[PDB]
Structure formats: structure tokens, C-alpha cells
């Protein structure tokens, strides 16, 4: 039952990481935790009774209104205050790149332990001043990680002055990181200016403790100011917290104890099966599994989908289940697809007797994104699966979308998305109301209305005239305007 904690952590990290790029991360996070199982058992039942303290596991607990440890995480280190106190106060600072940052400065004298995977440390600090850091670690990278984190955490001015270049770090949701994570990211990328301008001191002789120079060389004579490396150098109060929309967890006094930027990037492999049900975890098996599941999901929920489509489309379009598919749509074009498809849907609602089940299913995931309006008459819509742009044809079949009108079996890149059931609202006349934006196809080629136009000269017609248009290769049909 150590194997549960191990697998609960793997599952919580995945879920938080997925949640934070979603539209509503707190909503997505709870949805996925109620969705998931760890070896037969509901995740949310393991979270209510398992005492494991880890960054992602605690974000989840916070989301379920549970109580978690008051320690906080910064740069992957768990800080536990061992003595002292501090007050918050807001300050503006000028970096070494003459950028202006508004920082939440802490004033007071404080002692902390910092605990990490590959190094731990004891830290003493005061207002904008590091007083002492004793760090022990597996190798020079680990020690250095700890030292960088303590240096940014001290908030000292020479750290601020050590910035080069501008700080514009964002997360995957393109949201700016708060300034302390701005500075920490900048120095995690390269720390030599920071180490060289920090300052050097002669050191006293103490058993089991050595100095460290700006190039991570050990020294029995000198050391970076206030820093020592030790050899043997090396948690139970739980409090009520608040979790806001973007999963930043706070304590009563408004300190951010945990956020998604504090989740470890390590990706281990479970020793118990983890089973995600959420649509959010479809992408686990590649964009192909996204597409199949999207269309599969629509078939299985057809009865609720068909009536929300018919009377409350706003809530249909905004559903959580359509976010994964939306990733696969080029961000440049997705809004104009959405605006194209929503109009075609509205034509099918307004012009009655022309309900097409296969067509609604095909285009429905494209209406998720915000409707930007265009006038291009898309003949196909594109989704990128592993870097290549596959196309769904607005009219007819396709490797991506292949429906079989007799067997009624829908196929998605090969795999069987299901089978459609007989629906009386299905139109029997050949009128297609959801292929051409602003136009209605009325069946086969009829020569008495003229010879075949092409699609770019449909604009030269106005207020519902009746023309034949070359829709494909050889395929000619009769199309009227609204
Ligand atoms: O801004 C916050 O509230 C966060 C972000 C910036 C550093 C910590 C981790 C992320 C900080 N969280 C917390 N800081 C502190 C905190 C105490 N003394 C400090 N001196 C400098 C500092 F910088 C933060 C602190 N206490 C509890 C926290 F929970």
C-alpha cells in the first residue's frame, strides 16, 4: 500500500498538468479526480483518507475542500518554517535590465528547512537578505539548484541586479508567471552572473562543512557569501486553504502555498493500473484516440446532444468534451471554422425538414471555439494528427470520417466509432442545408437553370436565385441562396 501512494502521485501530476492548460482548470481538475481510479478504487476516496503530502496530490485535496500541510513549495523545494515570522509588503524593484518588477517582499527574520528530491538545506534569511544556507546534495547540479532557489527566495538586491534580458515567462496557457517565478525561471536557465556577483567570503573551519565557489568548485578556504555545503545535512500540521481558478492554493494570510508551476516534471511509471475516464485524458493515446473518442462520445450521447443542439446550442458548443478535439484544429483557423459551422447549423435549424444526423455529428466538434466570422466557403476542414494536416470533407466521406449509409457504421481513421440508429427526423429529400454557407443544395444537376458555375462565383448572386455549381470533380449540383 506504498504502491498506492506511488500511483496516486503519478495520477495527480498528470491530472494537474492537464487541468492547468484547460479552460476551467479547477472544474477540469475535479472532473478528472472524480473520473479516475487507482487499482479499482476511486481516486477521490484515496485522497480523502491517504496522508501523502506531495505538491500535485495537495492541489487535488485543496480542490476537494480538504486540509493540507502549511508548508509551501518553491523551485521544487518544500519549505517548512522552523522559527521566526514575516510580514508581506509590496515593493517595486529595478532589474539589471532596467525592467520594473512589483514584488511581494517579506520582512522579518525566518528559518526554514528546504527539502527536495536530490538535495536538502537549512536556510536563514531576513528582509531582502540571505543570512545562511547549509546545503547537502547528490551532485553539483543539485546543490546548485538549491542555492539558486535560496538566492531568489532571499529577494536580495544583487540577485535582482543579476538579471539580464527581459522577463516575460508564460505558462502553456500563455499566462504570465508572477515575478518571483519570473526571476527563478531566468536564473534556472543560467546562473553564472548571479553566482559571480553574489559575493565571496573567507570561511572558518567547521567539521563536515566545506565552501563552494561560483563555479561549484569546493573550497576549504573561501565560499560564496553565506553558503556552505554539508555532508550529512538533512511536516505534520494541516490547515484550511483556498484554491482559486488557476489552482493557486493559498493560506489564510494570502500566501501561495502551491500552484501548477510547483509540480515536479518527473514522469514515473505506475505499479498499479491507473484508469482515466475523463475526456481530458483522451490525448494520452495520441490525436487519433482524440478524434475517435470525440465522435464516439457524440454517438453515445446522441439523445442529449440532439436536443441541446436543437434548442440550447450555446451549452452544447461549450462542453468540456470538445476541448481535446479543439487542440487538433490549427489555432489560426479554428475560430473561422467555428463561425462557418455554427452558421451551417443555424441554417439547418431555420430551414426545416432538412435534418442530417451524419452532418451534425461530423461538424459538431468544430463549433466549440469562439466564432470568428469569415466568408471563405470551406470545402474541407483540417485537423493536425502528429504534425500532418488531415482533412474532413464538408460533403462526403474521408479517411478521417467515413460513414456507411447502409450498414450505418461510422469509421474514424479505421477504428469503429459506432453505428447510427434510425431517426424519423432524418430528411428524405435531397436538400442539404449544411454544406454551403448561405446556400442550400437541392440535389442533382438540372440544366434548365444554366450551366455549371464554380464556388467563387456564388457571391455574384443575391437574394435566393437558383444556379448549378460545380461542387467537386465532375459532381454538379443545384444550389440556391437565402
Ligand atoms: O508569492 C507567494 O505567496 C509565493 C510564491 C513566491 C515564493 C513562495 C512560493 C511561490 C511564496 N509563498 C510563500 N512565501 C512565504 C515566505 C515567507 N518568507 C518569505 N520570504 C520571501 C519570499 F519570497 C516568500 C516568503 N511564506 C509562505 C508562502 F506560501
Numbering used by the authors: 252 to 485, 490 to 737
Report text from the authors:
The conserved 3′ and 5′ ends of each segment are bound to the viral RNA-dependent-RNA polymerase, while the rest of the vRNA is coated with the viral nucleoprotein (NP). These complexes are transcribed and replicated by the heterotrimeric viral polymerase, consisting of PA, PB1, and PB23. Transcription initiation relies on the cap-snatching mechanism, whereby a host pre-mRNA is bound by PB2 through its m7G cap and cleaved by the PA subunit to generate an 11 to 13 bases capped oligomer. A few recent breakthrough studies reported the discovery of an azaindole derivative (VX-787) that binds the PB2 cap-binding site and inhibit FluA replication by blocking viral transcription. Here, we describe the discovery and characterization of PB2long (FluA H3N2 PB2 241–741), an extended PB2 protein construct that more completely represents native PB2 cap-binding site.
